[PDB]
């Protein structure tokens with residue numbers, strides 16, 4: 001039971017921003033990742049469809065007997081999370097609130113910004129979360145549909161990427177924000193470009209990175225932590241797309257040479 | 268449910284450091300504090316008797332419809348958390364693990380120190396928590412019985428307090444540790460002196476503060492956080508000993524003026 005793995009789902013490589021942090025904070029925890037690279041991008045897809053696809057990724061991992069489910073995707077979290085948490089016996093973790101509480105703790109301006117997919121922005125989740133914590137804070141949300149493709153295409157270091165991020169982020173310019181929430185688990189791979197565009201006066205919040213911290217206490221809370229020894233079975237990486245392009249960017253961002261990945265089918 | 272208070276039970280006035288921390292981190296949360304001042308200290312008492320008392324406090328608070336139970340006492344937590352956590356229908360939190368988690372996270376040389384009451388240290392609760400997370404860490408546990416009286420008599424600023432603290436903490440001086448957990452509700456008031464004695468290489472963990480950060484994450488997890496929105500009632504303070512003397516220590520620490528407390532009978 002406790003030696004069972006922790007499963008992480010996402011639409012593609014975004015989930016890896018959370019996974020990377022889990023390797024660093026929870027070294028003795030076995031992980032099983034699933035990225036629906038085939039149906040990506042979610043962020044615009046209709047909520048109902050996203051709820052569907054997400055459940056599909058869940059069922060795929062449930063058959064592998066995971067002890068905890070981490071929806072390392074803002075889009076999925078925003079629409080799916082309550083429903084899947086209520087339905088499953090194991091604990092389910094989303095990435096919105098951890099990012100929201102971290103932003104609230106770091107802002108000195110009370111002027112916070114958040115960027116994410118269409119779906120995340122439309123759900124007004126981050127607005128709704130921040131309001132319930134500190135209503136005096138002014139939140140400015142912005143959808144950035146062009147970002148995710150830049151990451152999936154493994155061109156998040158390109159000059160092209162820099163120009164897109166720049167023009168897209170100009171809409172948040174001159175609004176006095178001192179904190180910007182990376183409301184998409186894909187955005188941390190663009191962090192250096194985003195930090196450069198926003199300036200050194202703006203603190204970036206990595207939503208998924210903050211989530212691992214919550215994961216850590218939940219393991220103790222539900223007393224289902226893995227024994228303090230590096231797992232026997234290695235970490236499993238699945239993708240519904242080119243298992244090869246996955247390994248390409250996965251191994252680079254994670255720093256894992258010869259990172260294995262296996263393509264699969266859903267729905 | 269969401270509008271109901273959070274309950275904190277403690278041996279006496281110590282737990283007020285945890286309650287004060289909650290007033291800071293959770294301003295919208297209604298609190299209900301219970302302190303068995305008529306029977307403290309708990310540290311020098313045998314575990315069983317402590318388990319019995321803790322249960323009485325818990326019961327009394329449950330009858331008052333709290334949504335979450337916080338065992339602010341390390342001594343109490345070290346022996347009664349498991350049972351009470353398992354028995355109650357509401358979330359039950361203790362102050363040991365949040366601190367061990369934080370310590371393990373910050374140590375760079377694998378040498379964590381821990382101080383508290385004879386009871387706390389005698390239960391080996393911290394050594395157990397830390398080694399089940401990271402076996403490679405050498406845990407040094409020391410009981411410091413003079414610290415509580417030193418704090419309860421409002422003598423924690425005196426140059427005298429520094430000599431005593433320096434003398435008691437001499438043992439830990441030759442271990443080479445870089446992390447020391449303040450495993451007792453009283454110790455936060457001695458933090459400045461303890462810090463100077465332990466030096467700039469040592470990071471002090473405030474179990475009270477780490478615990479409140481968990482309650483915050485747990486409020487969001489179970490989605491039972493009190494609305495930011497309106498409206499709240501007075502915090503409630505209960506004690507098994509003199510309410511007058513308590514109302515003194517309360518305003519003398521929480522700062523709050525006219526804090527009214529009620530004396531009650533448990534068993």
Ligand SMILES: N[C@@H](CCC(=O)O)C(=O)O
Nearest residue numbers: 011014042043074075185
């Ligand atoms: N992983 C992205 C989803 C991007 C997409 O599928 O469009 C998120 O954090 O919401």
Ligand SMILES: N[C@H](CCC(=O)O)C(=O)O
Nearest residue numbers: 278281308309310342452
């Ligand atoms: N509250 C106790 C100290 C006071 C007592 O001895 O009862 C603790 O934190 O261990």
